Design a protein around this ligand. Structure first.
Ligand code: HEM
Ligand code: HEM
Ligand SMILES: C[C@@H]1CC(N)=N[C@H](C[C@@H]2CNC[C@@H]2OCCNCC(F)(F)c2ccccc2)C1
Ligand SMILES: C[C@@H]1CC(N)=N[C@H](C[C@@H]2CNC[C@@H]2OCCNCC(F)(F)c2ccccc2)C1
Ligand SMILES: C[C@H](O)[C@H](O)[C@H]1CNc2nc(N)[nH]c(=O)c2N1
Ligand SMILES: C[C@H](O)[C@H](O)[C@H]1CNc2nc(N)[nH]c(=O)c2N1
Ligand SMILES: [Zn+2]
Lengths: 409, 411
């Protein structure tokens, strides 16, 4: 029942009890571990236990468990579900829920920040044009001229499931990808399908390497509509290197605001299918993954060549040398332009401190080692040596299928 | 039942059926994943099914399933178990067994090599002196003057658990570690406890930074005995860098032969508690872990100092820069001395080819992503982007507790 996690660098052992409150399934069994697999409406009957579980945790959090106000709210919610088949969260409950969804996000190294989250309540939104306005305001608030602030914007909850709010984009800001008659890909190869959907819905594509995609927004189950984020709201950073003058001539840039827009926020059994959220980048996300994944911008070869490395043999570690220089350039460029960024050393150090806090104050911290360990220099970061238990707590952020598969036009 | 794994770089999808032959537990449940946890005498009744399962696998592999020879061997083993409470493996079965334990080792990136393993049968060994001789011979054979050859030496199986053979060393070759009164460590901090045991047992320690430890060998449940591996059998590589001439003056060296000696080999329900095995290094084992872990030789700072890197902020990535140069030096040094080593790019690329082959010919390849992904440059290797399924097949290598915790001292 009570489980130990050990840090093999420091010998510090922590005891996890929080996992006993986990509700959802992992995909693992006693026979098979699926730890490395990326992807392993509610009736009145389903909804009340979920609402109760959540309200209990909420009332406990404000030291009012078993109080009249606790029992009265439980009563009110029960009545509302029985009569309307759903219920509405109080603003206080919504903020608490969103913050805890982040707190519970086992794949997030940045959770030391979880209690400093600005929540924008967009449950009064009714149209796609309304969605666009809310998202611009989120973008400007979160960006804050480069001094980034964590934020989430929460659109109306699912009802019968035929009137879902969805942001079709995977992030609020991403670059277009285009199939060339040449056979190669211009721009971000990850976004080729979404770009085609944008063009088919009417977008006039510039056909460049870093074209910011328009938003495709769906309100109340309606067909999604296209909106362009005001260009002056999209803060970008040209990538240069502190030592290599030639680096700037690769013509690289990235955007300052990482903002996930395709996940589902579950609070007290209620499902918020459009809940874009944003923080700030850890540098490896851009320098290792976006730039160096073979299926992304794939720039290692070009950089290695400009460095005049021996590329004849893998054992020269030319890929590794170039990787580090690309990541140095990313961090330097963001820091020089005064756009918030965190390096993987600093972020993982903070996560260990957060884990210790959470064990001390909460009895555990669900964490997915496969995602928490950075994609370069794993074992020189403290999280590599830290055992982690992965389990699913609610409120939560969940992956959901791309809507173009789901949508009936 | 079919399980699919996807590669997120190539979109290649593979289908696992082999997991249906797993029976032992992972530590995970539908409610918790223990994928990053390092550590998540049989009766007659439990032994015959295990023997039968193994013999069935062995006879299928030689395309003699259900033959008279297969049926006769089942009968013969059944009679041996009922009469002696255990049984002895044929030489052929032992070899098949050891190769398959390697094939099944989900944490091993080197498994493309599994079918090429020299098995030394040391089941006739009776004393620690005898174990010492077998181990010297293994070291010389495996080392092969730098052209490393994979090998395993298998000592007698467990009987009542009161007569175990054990190599107390965690690897056949490792460097001593000495905790100083001021709380600093000389040599390898990983080996301080074991070094203290050796000294207590009578080892005269040179007290330097790279002192090869003596073997501490337990035969037939007796108290262990100390032996020094002949120095001329211990191949070492001084570490230097192809461009940085100051790298040699760090005074680093490492041994060429990585040889795990503390694991338990299970074949057909039998337990081989002493089964040292050796392959060759992947460079990152030395350059990342042994040299750069904070709790090991911990050389990052000194290297970065000598490179004149900006060390005032972690965001200069000075650690990452120094790490790559150290790993270049290890590969360069082994290659220049003609000692077998493989880089992490080569090794992971070969592993992916091995895994895809196994999926086609065997229906699966259990793999532990947490261990298979190298400890530097993870996402620029193809294994980072490969989904894996981790499950336990037998024959297998298992961790066992250090013998000093459990040993009954006779005196
Ligand atoms: C404040 C700075 C933050 C940092 C430095 C940070 C760091 C990260 C990183 C590096 C990842 C892995 C990304 C990937 O590999 O795709 C991640 C994942 C994630 N984070 Fe954060 N995070 C931050 C803020 C937030 C916020 C504000 C939320 C929600 C309110 C959040 C929720 C999540 C979730 C749900 C995932 C998993 C995403 C997925 O499955 O694709 N994070 N975090
Ligand atoms: C031929 C060259 C080989 C290479 C390059 C190789 C590579 C590796 C590496 C890098 C690891 C993880 C090491 C660590 O982090 O401590 C490992 C683990 C392991 N390998 Fe191999 N391997 C090889 C041969 C062998 C052989 C001959 C066997 C047994 C017959 C074997 C069985 C294992 C096992 C059981 C583990 C997990 C060990 C543990 O739990 O501590 N490998 N391999
Ligand atoms: C199939 C996968 C299932 C899943 N849950 N998720 C993925 C998204 C992938 C993961 N890896 C790259 C890409 O994720 C794209 C978004 N990256 C995270 C972020 F950059 F937006 C970010 C950074 C810092 C704070 C907040 C947000 C798809
Ligand atoms: C608590 C742990 C449980 C476990 N299963 N194992 C560990 C040994 C650790 C793993 N990581 C560092 C150290 O293992 C050190 C030995 N590494 C393997 C080897 F170098 F000896 C080797 C490499 C290639 C072929 C043959 C041999 C203790
Ligand atoms: C197959 C494997 O699960 C996959 O490549 C994962 C590994 N770890 C990751 N870690 C993070 N933070 N982000 C990712 O996209 C991935 N990808
Ligand atoms: C806590 C975590 O499981 C532990 O540090 C693991 C991570 N991955 C590893 N991978 C390898 N190959 N060897 C190791 O010792 C470890 N250590
Ligand atoms: Zn698992």
């Amino acid at each position: 029942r009570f489980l130990k996690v050990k840090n093999w660098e420091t010998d510090v052992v922590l005891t996890d009890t929080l996992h006993l409150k986990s509700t959802l399934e992992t995909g693992c069994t006693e026979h098979i571990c699926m730890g490395s697999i990326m992807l392993p409406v509610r009736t009145k009957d389903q909804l009340f236990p979920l609402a109760k579980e959540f309200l209990d945790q909420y009332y406990s959090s404000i030291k009012r468990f078993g109080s009249k106000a606790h029992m009265d709210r439980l009563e009110e919610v029960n009545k509302e579900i029985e009569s309307t088949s759903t219920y509405q969260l109080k603003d206080t409950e919504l903020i608490y829920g969103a913050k805890h969804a982040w707190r519970n996000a086992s794949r997030c190294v940045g959770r030391i920040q979880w209690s400093k989250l600005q929540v924008f309540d967009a449950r009064d939104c009714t149209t796609a044009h309304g969605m666009f306005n809310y998202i611009c305001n989120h973008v400007k608030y979160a960006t804050n001229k480069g001094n980034l602030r964590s934020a989430i914007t929460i659109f109306p909850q699912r009802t019968d499931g035929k009137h879902d709010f969805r942001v079709w984009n995977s992030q609020l800001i991403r670059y277009a990808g285009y199939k060339q008659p040449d056979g190669s890909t211009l721009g971000d190869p990850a976004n080729v399908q979404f770009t085609e959907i944008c063009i088919q819905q009417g977008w006039k594509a510039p056909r460049g390497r870093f074209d910011v995609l328009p938003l495709l927004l769906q309100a109340n189950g309606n067909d999604p509509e296209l909106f362009q984020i005001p260009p002056e709201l999209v803060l970008e950073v040209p990538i240069r290197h502190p030592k290599f003058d030639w680096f700037k001539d690769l013509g690289l840039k990235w955007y300052g605001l990482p903002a996930v827009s395709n996940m589902l926020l579950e609070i007290g059994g209620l499902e918020f299918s459009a809940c874009p959220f944003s923080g700030w980048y850890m540098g490896t996300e851009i320098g290792v993954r976006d730039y160096c994944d073979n299926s992304r911008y794939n720039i290692l070869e070009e950089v290695a060549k400009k460095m005049d490395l021996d590329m004849r043999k893998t054992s020269s570690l030319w890929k590794d040398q170039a990787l580090v220089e690309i990541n140095i350039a990313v961090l330097y460029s963001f820091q020089s332009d005064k756009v918030t960024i965190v390096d993987h050393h600093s972020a993982t150090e903070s996560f260990i401190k957060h884990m210790e806090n959470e064990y001390r104050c909460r009895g555990g911290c669900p964490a997915d080692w496969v995602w928490i360990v950075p994609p370069m220099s794993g074992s020189i970061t403290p999280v590599f040596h830290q055992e982690m238990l992965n389990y699913r707590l609610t409120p939560s952020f969940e992956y959901q299928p791309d809507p173009w598969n789901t949508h009936v036009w």
